[PDB]
């Protein structure tokens, strides 16, 4: 539709919700995108005594991304003697003599690593953690942050939130679509499954493991993995919102274009290797590395796809023979041998080989009997067709060593051993990460690539924790689309509403100068049917819950001593609060967001309990016989 932010009053609820979780810290907020953005706004435009530190911080962040060392030597010069330098030293914050010592030390030897100014970043933050951050909490930027965090924490997606275009995939459980999120308009791929099919093919364990593995790897914006941004589900199908890749897979392009050369294969191997290195740092073994899981974008760059069979090994150290026959390492065959990432380094050998020859290294006679392929891989050693080059020989020979104690990436340094193979000696892995090498094959923008029933209930319980939202990705999407504009009109709507209260008011502010615990909107429905849903602004005090309409201070209330209990009920598929009052009466509330429901339910229980326990020990207030 059109993202609408809550009104600034949401701060009262939201700040207590966050405070209860310890998320109101410089670290937890600064490390967030919308957090950093709003915090930067406050420092550059409202706290002069901190504007220089943010200027310098951002100039270091710009320097860090400079790719060419010749750039970094030029920028480290401009920065070191910039006006931001003679502006921090001039004021109160001159960097430690030790920190400055490190910097110009590397400047002297004319060495400019991207982390050259890192000792400055640490000190910069060490000088934003106290009063500066506190002044930010007190400001209306944190208020706006609370308004955004309320939206983020109130996300309930439905198919109505996406404009679906052509189909871009298909399989045994559902299709993959190209859609555009209505809120922001970003282009995503929607992988729709089907609970009806999942039950049929007994693939529930897979659909759940794919989203847990996606959760573990979808952090960091890795350019070589189809990463998840959202996960939801209608009453019949699971949905993954993933990176858009409308360019088919290699298993298809391989057959059409034909076999690739060592050079064309080198491009894919490099981009793939960076994908593995990403998972392996997060203790995730893929275990299903095959051309059909390598996707292409509209420019020809690749991503690892379908984490269904992935696995964690930070604690597990996993199990047995899982994968595709012909790509599974020895350890991934012996159903009684533990293995880690070493299973992928072997699977990559079979991956690239099939691109250079056209078939798995252990299936030449086109055998469909897995016992045959698993036999050739576990027994005889692989012998390259003499057409392979010397360097290409060293790589595959190293990535296919049945002995994990003698295989590239398995010797204690991981992918740093594969990246160093002479086969890649011509590559700048920095440029690989930036996706600056020419893709071998560019797909055309028009591809086609490549019932049964059964009912539901208790299987719906197995998906009660399927809905998910990756914070890093929702904020990034918002930042790169509608963030700044929404923040602009939202500012005008709040200013005009304040100007109007000026002409009518001089009254405010009800919640200030007292002992008010919390305030905000809720919808009330009273005893009985003889009322209907009405929206009001509530104020919670230690001994009473008042509420008002618009244009008049509260005329109604409800004392903590008459509140018997606070239960969570269900109405119109919407969760509400049920308040049992002394006289057998009931009072039902409906909050506008899930965080509000959690914070009101909590603050009401704490308020009425402490109040009744308090009134009892007061002769003048307690009920006498």
């Amino acid at each position: 539709k059109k993202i609408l932010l809550p009104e600034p009053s949401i701060r009262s609820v939201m700040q207590k919700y966050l405070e209860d979780r310890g998320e109101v810290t410089f670290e937890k907020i600064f490390s967030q995108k919308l957090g950093y953005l709003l915090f930067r706004d406050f420092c550059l435009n409202h706290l002069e005594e901190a504007r220089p530190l943010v200027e310098f911080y951002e100039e270091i962040k710009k320097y860090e991304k400079l790719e060419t060392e010749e750039e970094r030597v030029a920028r480290s010069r401009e920065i070191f003697d910039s006006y931001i330098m003679k502006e921090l030293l001039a004021c109160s914050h001159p960097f430690s003599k030790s920190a400055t010592e490190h910097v110009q030390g590397h400047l002297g030897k004319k060495q400019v690593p991207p982390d050259l100014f890192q000792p400055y970043i640490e000190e910069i933050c060490q000088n934003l953690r106290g009063d500066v951050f506190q002044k930010f909490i007190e400001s209306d930027k944190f208020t706006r942050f609370c308004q955004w965090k309320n939206v983020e924490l109130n996300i309930h997606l439905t198919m109505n939130d996406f404009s679906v275009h052509r189909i871009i995939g298909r399989g045994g459980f559902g299709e993959v679509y190209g859609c555009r999120k209505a809120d922001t308009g970003k282009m995503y791929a929607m992988k729709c499954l089907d609970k009806k099919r999942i039950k049929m093919k007994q693939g529930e364990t897979l659909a759940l493991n794919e989203r847990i593995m996606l959760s573990l790897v979808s952090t960091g914006d890795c350019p070589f993995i189809v990463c998840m941004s959202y996960a939801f589900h209608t009453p019949d199908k699971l949905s993954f919102i993933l990176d858009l890749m409308n360019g088919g897979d290699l298993h298809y392009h391989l057959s059409q274009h034909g076999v690739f050369s060592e050079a064309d294969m080198r491009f894919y191997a490099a981009e793939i290797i960076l994908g593995l290195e990403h998972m392996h740092n997060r203790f995730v073994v893929y275990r299903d590395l095959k051309p059909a899981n390598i996707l292409l974008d509209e420019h020809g760059h690749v991503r690892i796809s379908d984490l269904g069979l992935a696995c964690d090994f930070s604690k597990k150290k996993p199990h047995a023979s899982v994968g595709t026959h012909g790509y599974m390492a020895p350890e991934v065959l012996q159903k009684g041998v533990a293995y880690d990432s070493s299973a992928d380094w072997f699977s990559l050998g079979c991956m690239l080989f099939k691109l250079l020859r056209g078939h798995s290294p252990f299936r030449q006679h086109k055998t469909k009997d897995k016992h045959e392929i698993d036999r050739m891989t576990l027994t005889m050693a692989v012998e390259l067709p003499d057409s392979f080059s010397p360097e290409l020989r060293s790589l595959l020979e190293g990535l296919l060593q049945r002995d994990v104690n003698r295989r590239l990436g398995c010797l204690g340094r991981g992918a740093q051993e594969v990246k160093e193979s002479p086969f890649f000696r011509s590559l700048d892995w920095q440029m690989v990460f930036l996706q600056k090498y020419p893709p071998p094959l560019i797909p055309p923008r028009g591809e086609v690539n490549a019932k049964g029933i059964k009912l539901l209930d208790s299987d719906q319980e197995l998906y009660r924790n399927f809905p998910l939202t990756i914070s890093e990705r929702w904020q990034q999407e918002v930042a790169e689309t509608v963030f700044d504009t929404i923040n602009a009109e939202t500012d005008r709507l709040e200013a005009r509403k304040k100007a109007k209260n000026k002409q009518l008011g001089h009254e405010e502010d009800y919640a200030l100068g007292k002992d008010c615990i919390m305030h905000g909107y809720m919808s009330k429905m009273g005893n009985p049917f003889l009322t209907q849903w009405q929206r009001r602004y509530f104020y919670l005090f230690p001994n009473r819950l008042e509420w008002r309409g618009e244009g008049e201070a509260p005329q109604s209330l409800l004392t903590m001593e008459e509140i018997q209990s606070v239960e969570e009920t269900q109405i119109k598929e919407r969760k509400c609060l049920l308040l049992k009052i002394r006289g057998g009466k009931q009072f039902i509330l409906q909050c506008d967001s899930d965080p509000e429901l959690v914070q009101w339910k909590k603050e009401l229980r704490d308020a009425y309990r402490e109040a009744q326990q308090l009134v009892q020990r007061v002769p003048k207030m307690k009920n006498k016989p």
């Binding site: 007292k514 002992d515 001994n543 004392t559 007061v618 002769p619 003048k620």
Partner: protein
């Protein structure tokens, strides 16, 4: 041993006081007054209902003009009404919701209030911009503030659940004098007409007579079987009445140093919350936990009438200086004016 000799001596002195009081119990107030005619049936009507408080009312206090009165409520507000018209002259939201008491300065310039916040807050009603603003927070009690009464604009007496009372210097905000003696929560206090003395009533089932200028307890009164919630002086300052949770009011005379009468009834079992005298002292009015206000014949101990117009506890009442009306505060949100 030295403590056993001090306890035995203390009980000997209690015997002397007991026997000394009996020595002058030559007759009873009931006997002395058998010749005067009974007051008859006292009936009053509600002349005003004061509407505005959103929750229970805990206290009111008339101004010296017999027209303005202040009241504190469970809704965290002091309301200063004009009883003649029923309009509100001030609506003062408090910074603490647990207000339990309130007072009106004779000059009419200030009101005060407090509660579970352990603070007596003074409010200036004659400010520059007509705004009502907190002009002093008297801190010192370690328990709640149960009652308070201005001596003038610079002195106020307060009773607290911390067992003590205090005289305050409103300017310096300091406790000029402490009144230590009770062994339970002090619940009420009343100033003699001369403001040189006052009496308090605590949960130890006793009321004490305090010297305002010397901080000494001069006389102690007992007889109640439960907490004393209310207290008030007889108009001439030589006696006072008490209201207890034991369902009785009692009259005490200072010069005789003992109890004169007891106002009760086999049908009245709830506790008394507030007591006030009529102008001439002939009537003793008391609000009850049964939603009623009973009018007692002060001299003859009969029940003359009943003010019945509240749907919950009569928590407080007061009689105007000109004797023209009684105000009742109730847990039902309302104040009513009778005569």
């Amino acid at each position: 041993s030295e403590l056993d000799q001090l306890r035995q001596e203390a009980e000997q002195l209690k015997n002397q006081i007991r026997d000394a009081r009996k020595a002058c119990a030559d007759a009873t107030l009931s006997q002395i007054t058998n010749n005067i005619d009974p007051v008859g049936r006292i009936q009053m009507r509600t002349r005003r209902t004061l509407r505005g408080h959103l929750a229970k009312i805990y206290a009111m206090h008339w101004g010296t003009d017999s027209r303005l009165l202040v009241s504190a409520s469970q809704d965290g507000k002091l309301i200063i009404w004009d009883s003649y018209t029923t309009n509100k002259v001030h609506a003062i939201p408090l910074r603490s919701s647990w207000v339990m008491t309130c007072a009106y300065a004779p000059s009419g310039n200030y009101v005060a209030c407090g509660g579970l916040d352990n603070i007596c807050s003074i409010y200036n009603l004659k400010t520059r911009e007509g705004n009502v603003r907190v002009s002093r927070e008297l801190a010192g009690h370690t328990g709640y503030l149960s009652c308070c009464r201005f001596l003038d604009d610079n002195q106020i007496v307060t009773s607290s659940g911390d067992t003590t009372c205090a005289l305050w210097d409103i300017e310096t905000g300091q406790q000029t004098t402490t009144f230590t003696g009770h062994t339970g929560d002090v619940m009420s206090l009343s100033l003699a007409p001369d403001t040189r003395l006052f009496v308090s009533g605590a949960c130890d089932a006793s009321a004490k007579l305090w010297d305002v200028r010397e901080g000494m307890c001069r006389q102690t009164f007992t007889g109640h079987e439960s907490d004393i919630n209310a207290i008030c002086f007889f108009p001439n300052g030589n006696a006072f009445a008490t209201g207890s949770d034991d369902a009785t009011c009692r009259l005490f005379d200072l010069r005789a140093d003992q109890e004169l009468m007891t106002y009760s009834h086999d049908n009245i079992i709830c506790g008394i919350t507030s007591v006030s005298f009529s102008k001439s002292g002939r009537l003793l009015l008391a609000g009850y936990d049964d939603f009623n206000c009973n009018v007692w014949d002060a001299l003859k101990a009969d029940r003359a009438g009943v003010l019945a117009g509240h749907d919950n506890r009569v928590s407080c009442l007061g009689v105007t200086d000109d004797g023209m009306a009684v105000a009742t505060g109730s847990w039902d949100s309302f104040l009513k004016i009778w005569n």
